[PDB]
Design a binder for this molecule. Sequence first.
Ligand code: MG
Ligand code: MG
Ligand code: MN
Ligand code: MN
Ligand code: MN
Ligand code: MN
Lengths: 304, 307
Amino acid sequence: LVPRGSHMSIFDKRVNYKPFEYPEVLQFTEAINKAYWVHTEVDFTADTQDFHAHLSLAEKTAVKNSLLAIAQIEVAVKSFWGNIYEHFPKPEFNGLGSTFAECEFRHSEAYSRLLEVLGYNDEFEKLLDVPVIRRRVDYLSNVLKDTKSQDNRKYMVSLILFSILIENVSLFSQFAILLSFTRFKGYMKNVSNIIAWTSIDEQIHANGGIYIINKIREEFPDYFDEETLALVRETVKDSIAVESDILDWIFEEGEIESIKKGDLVNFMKFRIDESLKQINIPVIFDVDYKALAWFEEEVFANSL
Amino acid sequence: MSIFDKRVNYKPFEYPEVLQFTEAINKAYWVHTEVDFTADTQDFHAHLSLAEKTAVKNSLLAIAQIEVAVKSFWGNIYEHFPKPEFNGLGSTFAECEFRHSEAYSRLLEVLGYNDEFEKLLDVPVIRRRVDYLSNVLKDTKSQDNRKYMVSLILFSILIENVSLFSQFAILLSFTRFKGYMKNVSNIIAWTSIDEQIHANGGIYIINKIREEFPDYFDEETLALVRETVKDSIAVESDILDWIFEEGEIESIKKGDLVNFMKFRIDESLKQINIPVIFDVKVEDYKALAWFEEEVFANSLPVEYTKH
Ligand SMILES: [Mg+2]
Ligand SMILES: [Mg+2]
Ligand SMILES: [Mn+2]
Ligand SMILES: [Mn+2]
Ligand SMILES: [Mn+2]
Ligand SMILES: [Mn+2]
């Protein structure tokens, strides 16, 4: 009932370990812990046989390019989460950061293994030859520009875009494409386990980011202004344009039976809008999205 | 390029042996919420003397002194060895340290030691321990690769490989010899394995640096390591006096613990080609040779009767 006249912010350093000022962190770490997995649990022999015998050029191409697009984000040093404590110096945020950081190394190892197993290391090494990828790297660098910024204004914008695009949306069209092969044709079941587990992790990461973003709004309403949002939406709209072109590239040998480009665009636009709601930003696209409403239950079924 | 130079391409790894350590952690993965201490609190209440209770309590406070903290070292090794595989190793060990801080924070909570832990700096020997630990860690953020390397050596051989291990040994002795504190010993056993993996990962890195920059291991560095370790062993010996402040206990003896620590130091020094310091006799280090066996035993549907 009684508001304090003064308090320490999320940007100030609490030295004592417990109690946690942001105890809900444990919901996110415990969810990662419960979902803990590594790629060494999985054998891809059946998938390679399905691939070899029963997929068309168009289908194989979608699988290859969807995995290349996933690896473009996942097979990399992704230092964001490991450094959040430099910005939010609370013990529980080192906990959240380190938990998500370790998770990202499990991801990089899993996708690095998939590239090896399917014989795409060469295409991956030369992926910057693809125009739409050069363009995705450009938008990603713009999300990431202020991730190590001492300016807390500019760090918070990096965090919104990281949480809403990179964690919640950039990969998810590829995850759906891959899951569709298992859903509708019963193929690539082992790849779909990896995909589903990654989806579960990434949703947790996105929500963790959202949580922090809302704690920052709850404490600093003034940085959540007019010109900030002009950056957010411009950047987001533009990011979808690039992800739409990624889909054109993924299906460059033709559309496939199990999933369609149009429905995936509405899937991404819907997912964005739904996360903007959660950080009290009004929607951009306002979406059709029932087409890929099966995603969440297919993730659950392939999680085992 | 060397271990200190950035490599952009994820694979192949230049230091592939990283995966032996991350895989070890993965296979040993655990969270404290797998363990319940109700039976331990009953053992403690009913079946431990004051002397024993005090050794349990003080061993746990000493462990918490190190474990219940933000331990930033492993999470930032990538800043010094900017390789994808060291970001992997770092983040894996960094997450492990958060599992540790939650485990020991929970133990303090359950046994009712939060207040004593808040006031732990009132203990003189704890302040001296804080002093040697701050000296070990002082250059952990250094841009000077030589200074940083020395902090790594001391971190690995003292803080990971030794500082905690006498407290681990004390706690496991209750389970081994009296069958008490079994669930505590599970946590201890799991922590012991983790910290051994951390220590060995540090040893791995140190030797890669030795291979690529043999000049860094100079006479001044070996002298500083040797002298710091000696001082640190003197402090840990005195920590044992405080641990047993209400009297000697039956399950384990200070003298065997000091020899255990000295031996562990020498074995780590050998692995990084630094002359041994204590040269402990086989008859002395065999006293706690059970340690490894007891770690293994405590690191691992329904059966019933009707009439
Ligand atoms: Mg860092
Ligand atoms: Mg020399
Ligand atoms: Mn990921
Ligand atoms: Mn992520
Ligand atoms: Mn630890
Ligand atoms: Mn450790």
